[PDB]
Structure formats: structure tokens, C-alpha cells
Design a protein around this motif. Sequence first.
Motif, PDB file in Angstrom:
ATOM      1  N   UNK A 124       0.764  -1.133   0.024  1.00  0.00           N
ATOM      2  CA  UNK A 124      -0.148   0.070  -0.005  1.00  0.00           C
ATOM      3  C   UNK A 124       0.951   1.113   0.105  1.00  0.00           C
ATOM      4  N   UNK A 125       1.068   1.806  -0.979  1.00  0.00           N
ATOM      5  CA  UNK A 125       1.737   2.924  -1.310  1.00  0.00           C
ATOM      6  C   UNK A 125       1.069   4.220  -1.495  1.00  0.00           C
ATOM      7  N   UNK A 126       1.396   5.396  -0.748  1.00  0.00           N
ATOM      8  CA  UNK A 126       0.557   6.485  -0.652  1.00  0.00           C
ATOM      9  C   UNK A 126       1.074   7.511  -1.884  1.00  0.00           C
ATOM     10  N   UNK A 127       0.205   7.896  -2.699  1.00  0.00           N
ATOM     11  CA  UNK A 127       0.520   8.745  -3.902  1.00  0.00           C
ATOM     12  C   UNK A 127       1.042   8.021  -5.195  1.00  0.00           C
ATOM     13  N   UNK A 128       2.277   7.650  -4.979  1.00  0.00           N
ATOM     14  CA  UNK A 128       2.992   7.189  -6.340  1.00  0.00           C
ATOM     15  C   UNK A 128       4.272   6.443  -5.842  1.00  0.00           C
ATOM     16  N   UNK A 129       4.533   5.413  -6.494  1.00  0.00           N
ATOM     17  CA  UNK A 129       5.519   4.717  -6.084  1.00  0.00           C
ATOM     18  C   UNK A 129       6.860   5.400  -6.310  1.00  0.00           C
ATOM     19  N   UNK A 137      10.237  -2.467  -1.055  1.00  0.00           N
ATOM     20  CA  UNK A 137       8.619  -2.272  -0.787  1.00  0.00           C
ATOM     21  C   UNK A 137       8.068  -2.690   0.667  1.00  0.00           C
ATOM     22  N   UNK A 140       6.572  -0.396   3.144  1.00  0.00           N
ATOM     23  CA  UNK A 140       5.241   0.092   3.254  1.00  0.00           C
ATOM     24  C   UNK A 140       4.407  -1.007   3.903  1.00  0.00           C
ATOM     25  N   UNK A 141       3.163  -0.581   4.108  1.00  0.00           N
ATOM     26  CA  UNK A 141       2.274  -1.699   5.031  1.00  0.00           C
ATOM     27  C   UNK A 141       2.216  -2.717   3.922  1.00  0.00           C
ATOM     28  N   UNK A 142       2.567  -3.848   3.980  1.00  0.00           N
ATOM     29  CA  UNK A 142       2.599  -4.898   2.883  1.00  0.00           C
ATOM     30  C   UNK A 142       2.079  -6.185   3.362  1.00  0.00           C
ATOM     31  N   UNK A 176      -4.001   6.208  -2.340  1.00  0.00           N
ATOM     32  CA  UNK A 176      -3.210   4.890  -2.327  1.00  0.00           C
ATOM     33  C   UNK A 176      -3.060   4.278  -3.687  1.00  0.00           C
TER      34      UNK A 176
END
Lengths: 217, 52, 263, 263
Positions: A124-129, A137, A140-142, A176
Motif C-alpha cells: 500500500x503505497x501513498x500517492x505514487x511509487x 517495498x 510500506x504496509x505490506x 493509495x
Amino acid sequence: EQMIQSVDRTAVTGASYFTSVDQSSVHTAEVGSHQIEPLKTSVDKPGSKKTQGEKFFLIHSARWLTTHALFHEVAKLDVVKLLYNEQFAVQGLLRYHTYARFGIEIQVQINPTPFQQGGLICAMVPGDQSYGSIASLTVYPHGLLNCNINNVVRIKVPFIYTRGAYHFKDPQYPVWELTIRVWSELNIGTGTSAYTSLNVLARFTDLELHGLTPLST
Amino acid sequence: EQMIQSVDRTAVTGASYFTSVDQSSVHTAEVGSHQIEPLKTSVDKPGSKKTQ
Amino acid sequence: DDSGGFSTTVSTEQNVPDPQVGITTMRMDVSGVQAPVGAITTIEDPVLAKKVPETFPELKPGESRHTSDHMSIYKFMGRSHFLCTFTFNSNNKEYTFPITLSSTSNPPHGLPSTLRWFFNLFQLYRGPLDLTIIITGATDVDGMAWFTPVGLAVDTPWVEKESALQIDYKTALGAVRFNTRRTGNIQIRLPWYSYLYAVSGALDGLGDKTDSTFGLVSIQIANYNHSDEYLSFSCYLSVTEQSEFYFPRAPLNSNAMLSTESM
Amino acid sequence: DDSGGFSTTVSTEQNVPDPQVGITTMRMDVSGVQAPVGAITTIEDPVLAKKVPETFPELKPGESRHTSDHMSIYKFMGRSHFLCTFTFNSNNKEYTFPITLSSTSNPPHGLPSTLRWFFNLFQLYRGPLDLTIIITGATDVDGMAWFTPVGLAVDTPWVEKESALQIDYKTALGAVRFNTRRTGNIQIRLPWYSYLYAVSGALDGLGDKTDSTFGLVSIQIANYNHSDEYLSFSCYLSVTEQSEFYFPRAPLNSNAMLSTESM
Ligand SMILES: [Cl-]
Ligand SMILES: [Cl-]
Ligand SMILES: [Cl-]
Ligand SMILES: [Cl-]
């Protein structure tokens, strides 16, 4: 000296976000009162913000193949934007509020046969990778998926944004961007199914809606 | 039942020997109050019947 | 208001049910030598309109000479009123009539006189009903009758014809058998067996076809060599104490009050 | 779950911020002569993965020889790092550079080295920043500088040109004046004045144009007859204690870490 009753000219009525000012008013007439079904006609919780908005919905669904190379993006999704769509009930709430803040819960699942091997990663990546290291990775919350082990993962997050809420009708940038990439090439033995379909579930949490609006775009 | 404020039609104002009767009146607006010179601009008794 | 609504003026009950008794009794004067304030009001305002009407000085009426209050629906409609009537022509035949509040269905193929009138004074009805039926004519005629609930198989309505139903089926829904010689009348109770919460008379086409019916009655004769007299049947209905009546409607206008003129 | 959700297995915190200190200290052995259960686990499971790693018998590390913990962001970024640098060519001109986290905007027209790296380690930033700028070259040059918040008028970015702004306007946003002779450096604090909750570096085009900026700085010279030496300006930023950092991102991959190679 007996005073004789005469109506009350001016008055103010309304409900929720609708107010009325009346100058040549009078009182309101009502009959009977609210009745509670001694025998309910339906046993499900009566519709509520949570009922219809904070529940799960199937967002997107793709395939993962033996042909997919390491780090191959199996899915890039604007979670929020995806929910905003007639296809799901929660729309009925969004479609009429201008902005809203919230948290999310994502559930990603698949069904690899034990004769398959490999894995994926869901973040779950905010905005853009942006240009973040694919290999990091996990930060991030994964949720990690490994054939020999689990076939599901669940991630839960709160509102994370630069603004105090998301604007549906016309967004700035996605809240997200859920990314799903091949964490370890999916190989198999000669004869096994060379793929496994995959789904993504999402729902809002602590849904705070704001500003009723007639717009649509 | 909540009563909602509506202006007071009739009223009577005036000062000294001048009176006014108004039928479609409203209240009077005032700002600040009387100030006393912490430093007087003049030291003579303020004009009065006796003064003049 | 729990509905998130607000107001500055009040909201009182309008047209409240069962406001006063129907028999002259004391539940001094009723108004007088004071000042009739209830002689004036602004009817448009629901509150004010409830202000008790009074114009001149009157005294308390007193006591009625008769025990029971004729205006109590339960007691009034307690008088089994007229419903319908039909006559058999051939042997081993059957008739099936529905009990429909529908203001639309005009008699004889519908609610008549009083019953018609009554069931249109309010929106919703539910609860058992004590049907009683009188037999006229013939004799030594074996007969049977059964109550069929809304939404189930049943011989075509308002029509005399040979039954198209398994004896099994008929009896299964609860039935009764009798013979003209030994009786000439039957008083049995009809159950509140319906998938609906209640039924209504005032409706529009569609609903007027499903939600306007208590249920149906079917009477089948046997051993009636038409070398005999004629066989007539008359049905009357009476409301029970377990019957309920919700929400008052504006009564049917006179032009719609019809009666099956006979004798 | 207050959101009307339910589960049978648990939900623990994943990747929790500031887990351990950054300096060798004791917050016996660290693990040993027992049985290293933390040598095995199912990393896919969030709970299990937090199980403390241990493979062999070790002893407590001890105490570091230096006072402060170099891994405390506040102290580390407390070292004002490099931001940008430019040079004036003609007299009575001005330069305006934006403070943009954008990973996109590559230097010199963008965040460089350390600052670039740092601001992409997390998603949201907010809070004041202590800017300090060094003057190089010239002398007896009067100068002025002002902080302009995101969303307001300001001379075109990354460009040396003649200002197009009312002296009034400039000074109004809060400004400072100085002279190369008497100083050669300026350390002033930049305010958290923005209509946003916070700003971010990792974004996509659109937002990457509005929500990726703290604000802007503008420096205008005067009395600089170019018969003189050259005038260079270098800017450095240091994070303050009132600065906040929310949500950790995956660090920028090396290929995207750029530096303004000079001397
Ligand atoms: Cl006989
Ligand atoms: Cl027939
Ligand atoms: Cl006999
Ligand atoms: Cl220019």
C-alpha cells in the motif's frame, strides 16, 4: 382579561442540512408515532454508514503467470478511485459528498496449487511509487505471499495524505496506489496449470464524509 | 415552543423638551461611552447655568 | 425529533383516534356563563383547530337509557353484515368466492352494502373474521367448505363450475362438511393466514390484486338431483375482537356505495 | 474493529517506527546457552516476523564512547545539508528558487544529494525549517530576501531576471536586508505557512506540482557594478525540532540519487 390564541407568524424549520424560514407560518400536524416491529420483517442491521460504506468490495482481479518476470507489476491500482464507481454500494455515499477522509483495509487472495511455487508482494503505497527501490517495498504496509505457505494477506491503514481529505468528483492525486509485483518467479513442473488468478478486496474504515453536493464530475 | 425575536413597533423617545412618537420603530444604536480626560484639555469649570 | 430534524413551532397530534365515547354519559355545564373562546379559531393551524368548540351556554347531557355504546366498531360490526349470495344449477359442482376489500370490484362480484362501506373507512385490516352462512332451499344435500389463503391454488373465482382440485388438497387446508337436512346454516371462523402484514380496500390495480384480500371461501355441493328445488347460499361477515383497524381514510363518496338490490 | 469488521486471527503492528535506539547501550547476554527459537520463522506472517531474530549465543555489546546518538533524525538532519547554488550576472536582478521535495525535479533545478535522499524516506512533512545561506564573492552589495508560501504570486522559479513585484508586496510577506561587506551569511527560519496539512516528495505530476512544496525563497541584489567580482549564493537547510515526519517509504533507489557535481 382572557387572551385568545392567535397563530405564530414567523418560524424556522428544517432537518439535517436544509433550513427554512417562513413568515406566514402555522404549526405542524403529525399523526401516530414510530412503531417497532413486534415481528421484524427483516433481520439484517438497518442500513447505516457502516453497513453500506465500511464493508468489503471486489476491486480488481488479474492473472499471475509463469511468463511474468521478477518484479513484474501484476497490478497497479488507485484503490480509492476504484471504489468510487456505481458498481459498488459505497458509491451511494461518495457520489453525494464532496470530500471525505478515511482508513482502508485491503485483502488480497489467490489460489496456487501446491505444485506451483513462487511468490508475490503486495504494498500500500501513498500517492505514487515514485522511484522507490522495488526491493524495499516491505517498508510500506505490506503482505507477502508464498505458494508453499499462505494464499492470502491483509493490510489495514488509516488516512495518510497531504490534504485533510480526498476529493472524489475531481481528485488531486490518488490516496493509495496498491502495487502487486512478482517477488519470486512462479515456476512449475511440466503439466501443472501455468497460472493462478488473483483478486483484491477493499473497504473503507472510519468513514468521515463531508459536504453534500449535487455534482457528478 | 421557541419564541423568535421580532422588533418593537411603537416607541417613544426624546430629551429635555422634545418628544417623538414613532410607529414603525426599532432600537437605538450606540458605540463606546463617555470618556474623562486623564489629562484635561481645559481647566475651567465646564460651561453651566452659573458659569455663563 | 430523533430524525435529525428541528423546528421552532410545535407538532401536535392531528385527528386522534377514538377521541370521545359514543353514548351520552359523563366521562354543572359543558360550557357557559364564562366566555366561549372556542367560538373562534384558525382552522388552518393544527394546534388551534383542536381547541374545543363552544358557542353558547349548554348543560351536561346526562345518561343514555341503553347499556351498550352502538358506536364501538367491535360491537357495531359485531352484527354480522351481508356479503354475497349465489345459486347452484347442476349437481357435483362448486363455487369459490374471494373476500376482497377492493373498492374497485363492484358487486355482485365484490364487497356490497355495509361491508363495502366499512372496509373503506380505514387503510389497514388484519385479524380473524367470523363468517356465518345461510343455506336456502334444497334438502338432504351433502356439502363441504374450505378457507383458502391468498396466494395459493383455488378454483376460479366468482364462478360455478366443476372443481379442479384434489379432494386431498381441499380437505388439507382445513375444511368442514354438512348436510342441508340436519342444519341450514354454518358459523365458522376465518383465520388471519396471510403473508402480508395486513390487507386494504383502497388501492390501485396491481396491489389491488394481491394486497386487497383476506382470503377465499369455496363451497362444493353433492347429491343434488336438480329434479329437486333450487339451492341458494348467503354469506355474512362479522368482525372479531382479535380484529384490528389501522389509519382512518376519508369515507367512500356516496356514488361508490353500491348494494346488491334483490329482496 | 470499530468499523464493523471481524476476524478470527489477530492484527499486530507492522514495521513500527523508532523501534530501538541508534547508539550501543543497554536500554548477562543478548541471547545464549538457551535455544535460539528466533532462528526460524514464517516471514509471510506479520506476527511471527516480529519474533526477535537470534541465531547464536552473543553477549551484551556495552556502551558507545560518544554522547549523542547519530541516528536521531533531529540530530542528524540537524546538520544543515546542501540545497542549491546560483550566480548573478547583471545588476538590480533577482533569483527565486522553490523548496520542492519532488523526486521528479532533478537538480540543479531540484532537491540534491542528502536533502533529496532524506525527504523521500517518508510520505509527509510539515513544520518550520532553518535555512542558512552563504554569500560568495562580491562586496558592498546590498541584498534582500523573502519567504513566499505555496500558492501565491512570485517571480518565475529557477530564473535570474528583473523582479516583477511591487517592493511593497515583497517586504509585506516578511523580508530581510543585508550587505555582503558586513556579513556574508544569513541564518533565518522558514515558517510552516501552507494551506496543506503537509507536503510530500513522492507524487505524480498534478499533485507533484502543488503538494510537493514547502514554499519559496527569493533573493534580490542591488549595487553590483559587474566591473566587480562575481556574486555566488549557496543555500543549506536544517530540520528543526518543530518538524514532523510521518509514514516511512521505501528509500529512493540509487539510480535516482543525484548530486550537483561541482567542487
Ligand atoms: Cl322428508
Ligand atoms: Cl364445468
Ligand atoms: Cl328431519
Ligand atoms: Cl530580465
